[PDB]
């Protein structure tokens, strides 16, 4: 990855990347995009120097996106779930969809939906947790039940086995870097095995996925631009537009829109989908519309807590009004309500940001800038 190239040099205190004399230089556009991404990931500060989080990420041998997830995932014993998710995404999708099966016989279609439903109980709005369901459920399928499990649920056997092996290798890399017994750590199958996540754990996991893929978040087009794209209850879910965070505003906003994939868990839901969605990537293959490979849904304050670490989130001046007094302790310390803006700044009318819900925040003045410390 070009961001692996940039991140490594920054850990070497090589400041001038764009003009660096490579024997084989990457594109300047790619290098520039790499630097911005590492700024969104909190690896580089506003002056493009490596941070403490960046120094840790440089030690990992993975892509910086997944390196950022695994670092923030050692809370509330959520790490085994994240390792399974990262391993599944690294190896690929083990779900054979109805279109591939050519069943989009009626009895088989029923079993397909039952097979999908049992894995969807974790969360209504999230596809990434459906990957976590099969990968974790697989640890409870004995050796003689593997093939029966695969045929019954229409999964790919060889792809699932590779996921299980990758979990053990992947967990070693995380433990060795994080644990005080860096080299001595030995992984055991019972560490990989874990029970269902609690609702509090589910909410935390959504934030941890957001940590790696913060720049890949879209807002439903209705929220940002009401009436520019018609919306009503009869409309199907696959036709509801979404707008990525940094999309360049075209003269017709219809071009910027991205749409949910039919295979997603959202398609069968029926009620209106989430306003904010976190997606793994965008795919133009398939001429109907641009489609999202969705991960999960992120709420407003949880999203701001993630983008807080990067440079993709900006803060307004203190709000004043009924019951909005700005408590101030020191000339460089204050507590106030602020409305955060995520994405493009208001003065910037090229990229398409938006405003998040106001939230109380503890701010401390550094270098004349009121930097945020924590949310109240």
């Amino acid at each position: 990855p070009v961001e692996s190239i940039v991140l490594q040099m920054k850990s070497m205190a090589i400041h001038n990347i764009i003009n660096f004399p490579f024997p084989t230089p990457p594109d300047r556009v790619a290098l520039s995009k790499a630097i911005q991404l590492l700024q969104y990931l909190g690896a580089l500060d506003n002056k493009e120097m490596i941070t403490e989080d960046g120094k840790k990420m440089s030690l990992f041998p993975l892509s910086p996106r997944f390196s950022k997830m695994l670092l923030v995932s050692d809370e509330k014993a959520c790490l085994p779930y994240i390792v399974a998710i990262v391993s599944a995404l690294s190896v690929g999708d083990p779900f054979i969809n109805e279109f591939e099966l050519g069943i989009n016989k009626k009895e088989l279609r029923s079993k397909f939906y039952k097979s999908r439903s049992q894995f969807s109980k974790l969360d209504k709005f999230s596809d990434v947790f459906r990957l976590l369901s099969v990968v974790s459920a697989m640890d409870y399928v004995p050796k003689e039940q593997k093939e029966i499990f695969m045929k019954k649920n229409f999964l790919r056997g060889k792809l699932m086995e590779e996921i299980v092996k990758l979990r053990k290798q992947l967990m070693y890399i995380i433990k060795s870097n994080t644990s005080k017994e860096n080299i001595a750590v030995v992984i055991r199958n019972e560490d990989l095995k874990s029970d269902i996540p609690s609702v509090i754990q589910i909410k935390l996991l959504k934030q941890m996925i957001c940590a790696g893929f913060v720049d890949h978040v879209a807002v439903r087009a209705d929220v940002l631009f009401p009436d520019d794209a018609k919306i009503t209850n009869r409309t199907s879910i696959i036709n509801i537009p979404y707008i990525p965070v940094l999309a360049t505003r075209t003269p017709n906003i219809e071009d910027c829109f991205v749409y949910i994939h039919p295979t997603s868990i959202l398609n069968n839901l029926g009620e209106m989908p989430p306003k904010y969605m976190l997606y793994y990537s965008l795919h133009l293959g398939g001429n109907n519309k641009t489609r999202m490979n969705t991960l999960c849904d992120i709420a407003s304050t949880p999203l701001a807590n993630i983008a807080r670490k990067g440079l993709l989130l900006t803060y307004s001046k203190p709000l004043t009004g009924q019951g909005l007094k700005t408590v101030n302790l020191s000339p460089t310390e204050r507590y106030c309500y602020v409305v955060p803006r995520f994405g493009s700044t208001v003065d910037n009318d090229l990229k398409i940001g938006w405003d998040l819900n106001p939230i109380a925040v503890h701010q401390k003045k550094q270098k004349g800038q009121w930097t945020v410390i924590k949310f109240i």
Binding site: Q118, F119, S133, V134, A137, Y140, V141, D195, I196
Partner: peptide, 4 residues
Amino acid sequence: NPWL
């Protein structure tokens, strides 16, 4: 199993 719990996940199933």
